[PDB]
Amino acid sequence: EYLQITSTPIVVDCATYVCNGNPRCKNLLKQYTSACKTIEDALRLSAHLETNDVSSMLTFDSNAFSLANVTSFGDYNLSSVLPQRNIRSSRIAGRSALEDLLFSKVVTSGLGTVDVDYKSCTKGLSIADLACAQYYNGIMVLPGVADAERMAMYTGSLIGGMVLGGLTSAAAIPFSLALQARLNYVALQTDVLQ
């Protein structure tokens, strides 16, 4: 099942979109000084409110994170879900083995809403891209809060919480036993051998 939790923030510029950098519009927009003063803030207020709520749910745990390894899941081959550990960079955890297959499908075809870099739209030497074609009209796309790392620290702290039984400080019960406690909820198992 799929659910949507956030969208992309858009911040627009009044004086550039209204007219392309002519130094004569600004003598006429002064009479409309309250016309678009109420647009930039009306957008940036919601853009700021979104991050105060998205970042309030993405918690993180340290002990439960360390139990997300493939060696602590019995004989259930779940290795295509757990996050990848080493990327040879300054990242604690990267995308999982399944998220890459999802991102290979659609997001590469957006071309105008994801991880655009504005360091290249001001050097020429090539025909402007679609993303840089809108930056000349004042439309800017802010980066999101949930990057590749935080989503790999919040999800991994939930996947690793299943094997964390009610033992002492940091003991981990085998995963073959974590289902015996979730089956007695339905009906009491009266078979000695599993």
């Binding site: 130094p23 993180f60 745990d61 870099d117 000349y136 009610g166």
Partner: protein, 339 residues
Amino acid sequence: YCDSPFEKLQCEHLQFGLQDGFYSANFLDDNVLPETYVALPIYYQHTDINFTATASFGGSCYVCKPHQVNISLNGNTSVCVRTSHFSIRYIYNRVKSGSPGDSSWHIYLKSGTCPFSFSKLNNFQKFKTICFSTVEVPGSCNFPLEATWHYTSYTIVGALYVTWSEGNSITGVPYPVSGIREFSNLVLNNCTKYNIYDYVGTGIIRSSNQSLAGGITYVSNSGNLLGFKNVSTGNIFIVTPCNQPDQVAVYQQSIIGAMTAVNESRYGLQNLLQLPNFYYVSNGGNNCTTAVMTYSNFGICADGSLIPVRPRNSSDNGISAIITANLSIPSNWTTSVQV
């Protein structure tokens, strides 16, 4: 006074004193720019048109009306163009009496009913036929003529009658360049005012080398140019505007930092970082350990330095399981209230 880098933000937003937060800033500058012109191939042919006006004064009263005024086009009463380029002027003769007694009288053209202006006809405006004249003919707009003594009392003296018809054959020229065989011009590497294949705007034109076959004009989906191509060769060119907006942060009636897109210093700030998708320019230290402002994925603190945002710590213990081991069961309790 609008001189200081911070005194301009107030001077731009029409406000005495500003709040705290992020503000948009893009300071334009009025100046004079060179002009470039590129058009489809055609030969060159020119003509010149004067517009003179002589006068005499002193009949019975001076400040009332001039004694006599003459209007003539090149000495004729009607002259028009069979050629492909033209340019028109306006000449007032002040050496009528030898001694320049015309110092008091000011004579100039007004704005008539035509949908253009006399002083902007020399620009790259395109028509089919014009046929100026100094006498009344049916179906023709006109420019009045005015005479005044030290700007006290105005009066109307004569007029200039002009006809036209929409077309794409006759083009005006600022001045008659002589010795050329195909009128063209191109200025590179800094801002100009181009007129390229019936496109008007501003920007910087640079050279490049790309392998593309097809059209000679690549426009965006909003009517703006992005690059054209010289027809007698294969080289193309790139056109970009030369004023990009920025984002300024204001805190305690001062500028803390900015997030520009140009790799250089900015409005009074010196240091320069390099974020994954833009540049950051500030002049603070790197020892701040606090936060006062928040943005997408980082927090600008009091002096300008950047500080990454950290997640929230929270630990939990899972459900108990049926096993012969040592368990932990809560013993003492306390209460709390949430809203």
